[PDB]
């Protein structure tokens, strides 16, 4: 019950949505502090193979699209 | 009188919180480490400046509360 | 009243289980490039104590399961 709770629920994963945000922004410069280190050692996919092409997607269109429709159905 | 989608969602929300407070963690712990590598190099700061300052805040209380407040609706 | 919102709050869950899946690889490939950075100065260790031996778990399996627990206690 309570379909007033989805406000309440949403806001939570609004939170979450902050939260994974600044962590996706974050290990991004991260990474680009470590690809100016590598430069000089062959450069980052010659000390990590393919998986330096590996990047976090964004995924908040999607997130705030559920985020939205949990309000929308109640 | 059998709702309990909030209970469940309750305990998910705390799973991805035990999760994300851990990439916290670590990506910082990186940090860390890089800000020691980028000594001899005018330090992080003078190689990603605009951005250096970020971290990510830790949104705990916030999420604890909000999630406390659920499950305060029954 | 309606039974489209467990399945909309899974839905968010899954997409943040990706997203995050997703900042857990990337950190800990950063992680990857900083050890290997740090092996002529001593290890990882060396330079972040104990806190080194620190990884974010996976909680893939337990995030899903909890998942599946909603949309079964439906
Ligand atoms: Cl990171």
Redesign the interface.
Known sequence: ???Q??N??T???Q??L???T??????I??????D???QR?GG?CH??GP??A????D?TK??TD??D??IH??
Chains 1, 2, 3 share one sequence.
Not at 22 to 27: D, G, I, M, P, Q
């Open positions: 019950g309570l379909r709770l989805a309440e629920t806001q939570a994963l939170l979450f902050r939260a994974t600044e962590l996706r922004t974050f290990s410069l991260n990474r680009k502090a470590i100016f280190l590598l050692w980052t000390i990590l998986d330096c590996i990047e976090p997607h995924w999607n997130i559920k985020i429709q949990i159905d109640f």
